[PDB]
Paper text:
Y-family DNA polymerase κ (Pol κ) can replicate damaged DNA templates to rescue stalled replication forks. Access of Pol κ to DNA damage sites is facilitated by its interaction with the processivity clamp PCNA and is regulated by PCNA mono-ubiquitylation. In this work, we present cryo-EM reconstructions of full-length human Pol κ bound to a primer/template (P/T) DNA substrate, an incoming nucleotide, and wild-type PCNA (wt-PCNA) or PCNA mono-ubiquitylated at K164 (Ub-PCNA), at resolutions between ~3.4 and ~6.4 Å. The structures of the complexes with either wt-PCNA or Ub-PCNA are very similar and show the Pol κ core docked to one PCNA protomer through the internal PIP-box adjacent to the PAD.
Purified Ub-PCNA was mixed with Pol κ, the (25/38) P/T DNA containing a dideoxy chain terminator in the primer strand, and dTTP. Refinement of the main 3D class yielded a reconstruction of the Pol κ−DNA−Ub-PCNA complex at 3.7 Å resolution which is nearly identical to that obtained with unmodified PCNA (RMSDCα ~ 0.5 Å), and where the ubiquitin moieties are not visible. A different 3D class showed residual density protruding radially away from the back face of PCNA where the three lysine residues at position 164 are located. Refinement of this class yielded a map at 6.4 Å resolution, which was further improved by density modification implemented in Phenix44. Additional differences compared to the reconstruction of the complex with wt-PCNA are the appearance of a rod-shaped density corresponding to αN1 of the N-clasp of Pol κ, and a slight tilt (~5°) of the catalytic domain towards the PCNA monomer bound to Pol κ. Density at the ubiquitin positions is weak and the map local resolution lower than the average, implying that the ubiquitins covalently attached to PCNA retain a significant degree of flexibility. However, the density protruding from the PCNA monomer bound to Pol κ is better defined and displays the characteristic barrel-shape of ubiquitin (Ub1, Fig. 4a−c). However, due to the weak map density and local resolution in the Ub1 region, we cannot exclude that ubiquitin may exist in multiple orientations which the cryo-EM reconstruction could not resolve. The outward location of ubiquitin density implies the exposure of the ubiquitin hydrophobic patch to interact with Pol κ UBZs, but the map features are at odds with the existence of a rigid Ub/UBZ complex, suggesting that the Ub/UBZ interaction is transient and/or involves multiple ubiquitin and UBZ conformations. Our cryo-EM structure of PCNA enzymatically mono-ubiquitylated at K164 in complex with both Pol κ and DNA shows that the orientation of Pol κ relative to PCNA is dictated by the PIP-box and DNA interactions, and that the three ubiquitins are partly flexible and extend away from the PCNA ring.
Author numbering:
A (entry chain A): 45 to 224, 282 to 408, 412 to 534
B (entry chain D): 1 to 106, 109 to 186, 191 to 255
C (entry chain B): 1 to 106, 109 to 185, 191 to 255
D (entry chain C): 1 to 188, 191 to 255
The structure:
Amino acid sequence: KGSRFYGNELKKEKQVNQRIENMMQQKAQITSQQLRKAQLQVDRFAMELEQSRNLSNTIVHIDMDAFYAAVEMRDNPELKDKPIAVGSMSMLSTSNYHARRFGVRAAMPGFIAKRLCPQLIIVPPNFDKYRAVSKEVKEILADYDPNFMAMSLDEAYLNITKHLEERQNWPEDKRRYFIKNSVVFGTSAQEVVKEIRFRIEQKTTLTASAGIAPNTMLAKVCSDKNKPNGQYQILPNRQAVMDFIKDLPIRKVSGIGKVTEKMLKALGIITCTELYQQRALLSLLFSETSWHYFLHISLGLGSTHLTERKSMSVERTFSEINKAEEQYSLCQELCSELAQDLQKERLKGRTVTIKLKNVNFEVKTRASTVSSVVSTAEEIFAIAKELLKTEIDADFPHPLRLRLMGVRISSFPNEEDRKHQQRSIIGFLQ
Amino acid sequence: MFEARLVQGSILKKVLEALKDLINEACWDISSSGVNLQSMDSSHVSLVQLTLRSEGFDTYRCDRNLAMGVNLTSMSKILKCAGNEDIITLRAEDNADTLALVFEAPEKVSDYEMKLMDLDVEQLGIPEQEYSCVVKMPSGEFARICRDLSHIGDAVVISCAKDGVKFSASGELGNGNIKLSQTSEEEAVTIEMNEPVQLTFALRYLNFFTKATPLSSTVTLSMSADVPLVVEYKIADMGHLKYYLAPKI
Amino acid sequence: MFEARLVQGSILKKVLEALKDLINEACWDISSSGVNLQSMDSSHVSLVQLTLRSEGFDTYRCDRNLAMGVNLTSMSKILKCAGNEDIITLRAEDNADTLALVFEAPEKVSDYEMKLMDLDVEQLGIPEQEYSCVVKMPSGEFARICRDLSHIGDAVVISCAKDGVKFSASGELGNGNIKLSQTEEEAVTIEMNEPVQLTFALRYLNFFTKATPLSSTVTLSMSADVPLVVEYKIADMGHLKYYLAPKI
Amino acid sequence: MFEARLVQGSILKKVLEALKDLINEACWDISSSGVNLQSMDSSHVSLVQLTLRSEGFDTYRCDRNLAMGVNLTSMSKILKCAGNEDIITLRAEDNADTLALVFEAPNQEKVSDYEMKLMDLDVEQLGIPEQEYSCVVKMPSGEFARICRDLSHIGDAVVISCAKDGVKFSASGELGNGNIKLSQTSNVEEEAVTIEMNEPVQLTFALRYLNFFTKATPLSSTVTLSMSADVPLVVEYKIADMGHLKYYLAPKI
DNA sequence: AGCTATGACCATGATTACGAATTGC
DNA sequence: TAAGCAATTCGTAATCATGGTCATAGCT
Ligand SMILES: Cc1cn([C@H]2C[C@H](O)[C@@H](COP(=O)(O)OP(=O)(O)OP(=O)(O)O)O2)c(=O)[nH]c1=O
């Protein structure tokens, strides 16, 4: 409305509109002669892309159906016909399908959606249960492919290009399960996924969507087509990839978000056919990796064959602070809890990057790289108090009015660089 | 009103020629018994500790404890102006932000003034413990050794035993092994060996340690296990300059 | 046929190594009085006045009165090719634009035939004043005081009273306030009339004090608001004077 | 195996100092007569040759005529880690990847063992057969380094002429032709510039290399130069009666 | 006082680090 | 009064390794 959050998104709106006009001023200064060499180059590379468009594999994505709500619903039998909401009065993680139509979505505050539905319940989650109900599903997913790639706790890219051929010579009770025998599932590529959904159904007391595609980005959106408890399928043939690549908004694809949406509402893009019809425009306008992503999201291309940790953070928000001792003392708890969580995987980090947020919402990530590997609650804090010092005393007569501080260990080392691990001196001092 | 007359001026020139390359700022504690310095550098690998007590000063007086932050390159640019013989008279008032050096040639009485700053160096050091290997060797040889393995690699292996002590380094052009075998008046190699200890350090701090070479001719390397190497120089009748360095792996 | 043979060959070497840094090309006026030069730097502040008389040239012969334009960098890079114990024979003709040099060694002679040029000459005179203060100090101590002072700032305030000559400066750290009191060829003598306190800039005095190996001692010559003389006297050959103007 | 002890531990700190910016890879033919080297440099005009024969060594044993491919820049970075008055022993196995250097001080308390990783290359043994010359000039070493560092400020080419009464080093430039003239010496230490001749010589050479060739000047106190027509200039240094170091450089056009 | 050593100071690509912005779940 | 993690993108800029130059000093 007219909030501080409204003020900072107003400034961000000014900035994105300024970049809109800075793009339109570089859009007018091209001609019909500047649409020649770039178009020929990007379609020569698209000939090099589409000729070896190999899609003999069958990649399956398996989402869930309101995962953080559904795993509560397998553990809350009282209100199965009710709309549930996880989170609290600041932010929602995900709400269920009895409330999606009413507007109760993700990335929405706990006060925006709650004034829309007076009859609702909002209960904070239990983050330990989902880590087990993920692994229970992963037990079923490991059988159909050992190299499955769980992105989050629920999404799961699986490759069933090999399991299907080694299923043809099977009997009619190996391919038949029991309700918790029940209906026999066939040998087709739809049927293996029907079997997977049935096992995840009557082994977790829940439901799970799915999606079959020749590629990964197609699977991510086919998993959204027939969405609650449903599925979809595309056939591996170069014609049939084109009939679904049309008539799609770019509010649906992942990797094209909200601001790259508005920077393409300018050039007249809604469908991916229009997004294909601007080869020499988008190749000259946008950056290198972004026009790469646009030219490969145009023909529907991507990952034809499937494939450690690189950061670990703790951030924390709070009310308004205006003192000098409270920031220095509250950086220590965030150094300590992160030092607890850094040893459970036994990783030696060598960078601390604090990150502060004003009461009028500006990010300030102040980084510092050391040469001593950092593990413990006192070998971090003497790298972050010298950044809280540099950015408290650079406002020389005035305090910092922050609302969020957060530390971030990074640059975890290789096997070539974990045999020479230099140590800090603060282990030895007293 | 801190006031300190040093009749051998080259001691202070040699100290702040040693400390300006490794660290670049310091916070000197000047109290009623001497000058102390405690400083770890930016990468938090080495520590340098320094004490010159109030007896080798040709005159010293101080009435209240002072903390004096000093840019060491500014002080090494000011103290480049004394000759090797200037009676150096460092004066400083208490609540003023300037340190008045007054040189005196043996009547060319210069009078320089420096700006201080607000520096908060960490008020902690290695607690008092006991050490396993204590080599004492000629400091020209120690500087030659620490400058004679950096041509190989950035890792020194100090392997200490009873007959002697061995320095080895292995880098992309090969490897090298210098062996010190014990002696038979200041070319004397005494090894107070207890347990034979093999460790590995970074030469990019051992080369900065050997810039206090004309402050003595005898250096004591004191090692243990899971404990930093100590290199110690003794400024004669004055005090000491110690360098602690952390090991690899 | 001008010939000027000097027997202490290090003289011209220390002179031209004190001049090649400041001014680029200059005019050599060649007469029975000797060798003369007045020139300005390329920033029009300092005024170099070199005077060499004919008494101590070991053999002099100058019939006409010539003027020779030289670029001092090439002349000094020729004057880095002789030892500190040679006999210089400078030579010139009216039929050529070639300043010849011969270095004689007591059996390695060194012939050089350097190019001249043709500059548009400026004969500016110096009205001689009666100086307020003239001080004489050993050359190395002044070289040390200016070089030492250059690390502190650039605004040297030379002060003078009968008891003491008092150099000050300032800068981003604090004022290096050197003194020298009233005091055996290495003494400090102060001839004072009125006390002086006058500003100069160190970044040209540093170009000046590279004539320190010429003489054992220098003389500063000052008046109120008149440009000062810094004079390095070659013994029994002439002198080399540098003029600097005060600021503000 | 090959082991060679040499008491003058400074000669390898100077022979392998005159040869680090010139070349960067060479073929040490370690055989029964002693250490050799032959190398045209990174510009393929200047021919280094080097020989430390056997009888000048303190002790010396090998029978397998081996051919070590030696990187001279890293070897000089290792030999710059020794004292001046040390004693140097070389150690090599037969099929060895590495080579061991032993630096024993005469104080004997400190001993150094360095180990250098080799390589393998093949170099042209472009043999330099028996020739007869025209003019020989035998002169001080600091004088020759001084002459070339003088004339390299004037120009960048040098005419060298040798006649019965001495030598002219004539160096034109953009600013006027320098000229330095040297004569003999009759009845006098190191000052003797003895110049013998059968027919006079006027040749011409460059000066980018005679600021490299007289980097060998702490190795001796007399250099010799030799010259004739249609034969390159021979810049010869002698070492402490162990052998010699030749540089070869050709005339111009 | 020149020759040479050599340590302080300085130009300077260049890899590496920093930081805001953007996307996901 | 508007989260909590992680991952990635580009353009800015800090530090470092590099050779060149200069000054002062041990050696000649
Ligand atoms: C998108 C999003 C998800 N999550 C959490 C909550 C969800 O339960 C879980 C899964 O993300 P998603 O699977 O995309 O969302 P969902 O399964 O809740 O809803 P749908 O089935 O319609 O996709 O991850 C967040 O915490 N924050 C977010 O911004």
